[PDB]
Amino acid sequence: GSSGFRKMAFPSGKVEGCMVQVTCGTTTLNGLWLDDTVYCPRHVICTAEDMLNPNYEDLLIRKSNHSFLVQAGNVQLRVIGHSMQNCLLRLKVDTSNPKTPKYKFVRIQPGQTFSVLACYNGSPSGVYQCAMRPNHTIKGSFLNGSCGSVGFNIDYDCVSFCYMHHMELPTGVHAGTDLEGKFYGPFVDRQTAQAAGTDTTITLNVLAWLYAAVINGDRWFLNRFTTTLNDFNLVAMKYNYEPLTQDHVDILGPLSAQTGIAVLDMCAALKELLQNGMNGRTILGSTILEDEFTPFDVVRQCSG
Amino acid sequence: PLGSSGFRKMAFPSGKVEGCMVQVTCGTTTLNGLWLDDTVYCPRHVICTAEDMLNPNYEDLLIRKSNHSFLVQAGNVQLRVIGHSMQNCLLRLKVDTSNPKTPKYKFVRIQPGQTFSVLACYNGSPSGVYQCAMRPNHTIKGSFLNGSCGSVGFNIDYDCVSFCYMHHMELPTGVHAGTDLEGKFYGPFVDRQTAQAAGTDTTITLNVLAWLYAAVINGDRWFLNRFTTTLNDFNLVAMKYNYEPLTQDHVDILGPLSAQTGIAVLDMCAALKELLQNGMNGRTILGSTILEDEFTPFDVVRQCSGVTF
Numbered sequence: 173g174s175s176g177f178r179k180m181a182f183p184s185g186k187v188e189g190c191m192v193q194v195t196c197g198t199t200t201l202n203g204l205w206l207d208d209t210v211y212c213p214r215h216v217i218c219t220a221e222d223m224l225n226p227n228y229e230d231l232l233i234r235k236s237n238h239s240f241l242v243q244a245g246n247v248q249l250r251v252i253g254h255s256m257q258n259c260l261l262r263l264k265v266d267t268s269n270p271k272t273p274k275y276k277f278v279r280i281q282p283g284q285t286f287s288v289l290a291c292y293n294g295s296p297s298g299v300y301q302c303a304m305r306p307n308h309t310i311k312g313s314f315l316n317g318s319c320g321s322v323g324f325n326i327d328y329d330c331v332s333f334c335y336m337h338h339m340e341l342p343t344g345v346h347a348g349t350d351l352e353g354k355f356y357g358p359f360v361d362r363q364t365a366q367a368a369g370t371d372t373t374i375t376l377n378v379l380a381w382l383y384a385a386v387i388n389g390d391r392w393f394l395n396r397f398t399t400t401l402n403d404f405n406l407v408a409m410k411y412n413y414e415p416l417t418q419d420h421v422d423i424l425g426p427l428s429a430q431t432g433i434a435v436l437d438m439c440a441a442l443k444e445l446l447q448n449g450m451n452g453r454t455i456l457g458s459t460i461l462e463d464e465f466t467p468f469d470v471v472r473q474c475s476g
Numbered sequence: 477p478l479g480s481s482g483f484r485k486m487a488f489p490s491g492k493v494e495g496c497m498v499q500v501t502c503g504t505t506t507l508n509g510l511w512l513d514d515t516v517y518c519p520r521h522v523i524c525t526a527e528d529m530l531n532p533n534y535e536d537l538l539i540r541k542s543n544h545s546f547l548v549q550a551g552n553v554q555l556r557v558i559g560h561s562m563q564n565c566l567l568r569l570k571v572d573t574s575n576p577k578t579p580k581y582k583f584v585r586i587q588p589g590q591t592f593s594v595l596a597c598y599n600g601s602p603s604g605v606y607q608c609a610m611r612p613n614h615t616i617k618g619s620f621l622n623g624s625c626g627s628v629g630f631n632i633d634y635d636c637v638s639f640c641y642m643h644h645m646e647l648p649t650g651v652h653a654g655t656d657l658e659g660k661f662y663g664p665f666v667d668r669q670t671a672q673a674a675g676t677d678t679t680i681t682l683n684v685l686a687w688l689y690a691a692v693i694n695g696d697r698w699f700l701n702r703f704t705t706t707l708n709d710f711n712l713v714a715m716k717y718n719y720e721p722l723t724q725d726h727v728d729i730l731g732p733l734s735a736q737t738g739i740a741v742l743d744m745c746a747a748l749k750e751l752l753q754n755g756m757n758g759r760t761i762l763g764s765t766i767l768e769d770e771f772t773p774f775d776v777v778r779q780c781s782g783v784t785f
């Protein structure tokens with residue numbers, strides 16, 4: 173029967189065990205403690221007067237290991253070393269985190285999804301799933317004090333960290349870096365006017381989602397038409413949708429085979445949906461075309 | 477404050493519950509169990525075989541089982557069962573080892589409309605976490621596959637994990653049914669594969685109002701007006717849109733949010749009233765085109781204030 177369909181995140185336990193608090197001056201934010209290293213946003217070393225045009229090289233050289241206070245719960249972890257890697261600081265501590273899970277650092281591609289463990293003062297608040305926007309921003313829910321929180325994916329027992337939160341744009345969206353400290357998107361960590369490129373809807377994901385609805389027993393939006401890749405794009409682009417490529421249709425191969433619905437035939441269905449709307453109906457409980465589920469997310473939730 | 481663009485359906489951090497999940501096998505039937513101190517809780521149908529699910533006689537099936545009939549595994553280690561008993565629709569297996577990861581906890585029976593986080597599990601291993609609401613018709617719209625029974629629902633009340641749900645089955649309409657941690661089903665359902673149907677469901681009015689307050693808190697207040705309504709007049713309109721009747725008790729539950737925004741509950745009802753009769757006119761609330769009903773007054777305070785655990 174139907175499996176049901178929820179926007180689910182990965183269990184956050186393996187990440188919770190790595191969260192700590194990092195303070196420098198009067199600024200306190202979150203850090204990630206793996207083995208004997210603690211990672212956090214480099215702006216932790218900024219003072220109110222340094223946020224407009226900071227020179228992190230100059231601000232950091234003025235610091236020592238003891239300028240940093242890291243705390244795991246109520247216990248202080250002594251910093252015995254420090255270095256800056258792009259927009260992150262790597263603080264070495266004198267004790268290893270026994271809760272460090274198997275892990276790796278990965279830089280995800282726009283359109284891919286991940287789980288965010290929102291934290292404050294080194295303590296977990298909640299977890300939610302989201303997708304990195306085509307324009308590299310994240311439509312997240314973050315309050316002041318949330319910097320340092322991380323995004324991740326879990327494959328079996330291995331945690332793949334892919335994001336660390338740094339800031340909020342004038343438009344209300346969020347931006348951050350991978351665990352190597354490199355920003356996602358054309359952004360810099362300073363309080364200046366910065367804008368993201370034009371965003372688009374993740375076409376691959378909307379299609380994967382339409383397949384999820386079908387494997388779950390719903391087919392009302394299908395039709396007897398088909399389309400070429402080119403003709404589909406001429407329409408989709410009018411609605412601010414990401415151009416679809418042959419690689420994307422190949423990625424949908426498995427889902428296509430499981431449902432018996434050709435990728436291009438599903439594109440024809442999407443084409444009709446964009447042109448006529450849903451006429452008051454819903455798909456998997458939604459009144460809008462959902463784009464935060466990748467083909468992989470669908471196969472894992474609807475078929476293990 | 478949150479990033480002015482969408483209220484995420486945030487689940488509670490799941491670590492404390494992940495440390496309580498184990499695998500329970502009886503014969504060829506394997507599912508999930510909850511290990512707290514020296515007891516492992518699981519659905520009683522674990523003692524059932526393929527064809528013995530239409531109308532199993534649990535009391536009699538259990539008689540044929542001994543402690544050795546149960547194989548419990550925490551990770552790659554076997555947990556020796558030294559006792560077993562049935563409590564309503566659950567089994568309580570006593571083991572010779574107290575869970576070193578047992579967190580402070582309590583068992584609570586959730587009420588209609590209230591939400592909780594579900595930790596989907598398979599073979600004793602956590603797979604995902606998501607937020608769910610106990611629908612007015614006593615079912616939940618979850619996401620479960622075979623091997624998922626035994627997975628649990630919970631809330632974290634400060635420093636205490638409050639377990640409120642254990643998964644048992646799926647209904648023909650694609651929704652789910654389960655029990656509290658005392659083994660008592662929510663709703664009139666029973667754990668046997670017979671003809672069972674959930675009643676017609678309604679929109680959780682209390683939650684929709686809570687969500688509108690969250691909108692205001694976030695700065696999305698275009699839908700507010702200078703009027704008010706009577707409880708009776710609101711219900712006359714809302715029930716037309718299949719909304720659950722609003723009660724004075726519900727008004728009181730919204731008290732903290734009403735105080736935070738200075739907007740009287742009936743004044744918010746007036747706004748909701750207009751939204752239902754006039755629609756949103758293409759506008760959005762908290763980045764949504766529809767009125768969300770799976771966020772409770774508590775979920776709102778939790779996300780807006782950034783409560784931690």
Ligand SMILES: */C(=C\C(=O)OCC)[C@H](C[C@@H]1CCNC1=O)NC(=O)[C@H](CC(C)C)NC(=O)[C@@H](NC(=O)[C@@H](NC(=O)c1ccoc1)C(C)C)C(C)C
Nearest residue numbers: 200201215314316317318319338339340342361363364365
């Ligand atoms: C994490 C900080 C933390 O935990 O501090 C503990 C002491 C925060 C997280 C944000 C707060 C609100 N939402 C968030 O996600 N990060 C920051 O405060 C950064 C710090 C900078 C990079 C050193 N700053 C911001 O997010 C500020 N943004 C901006 O200044 C942006 N500019 C616009 O809003 C603007 C108006 C005119 O020019 C720009 C900027 C593009 C990055 C926001 C306003 C706090």
Ligand SMILES: */C(=C\C(=O)OCC)[C@H](C[C@@H]1CCNC1=O)NC(=O)[C@H](CC(C)C)NC(=O)[C@@H](NC(=O)[C@@H](NC(=O)c1ccoc1)C(C)C)C(C)C
Nearest residue numbers: 506507529620623624625644645646667668669670671672
């Ligand atoms: C958990 C079982 C498990 O983990 O087994 C390990 C060996 C499952 C969970 C469901 C699988 C799919 N989604 C789920 O949530 N629970 C069950 O298999 C129960 C077991 C019964 C209570 C002993 N059975 C079901 O969920 C079956 N449901 C039904 O048979 C329902 N009836 C309708 O479909 C119906 C009405 C008239 O004929 C059928 C029944 C009302 C409970 C589902 C189909 C497997």
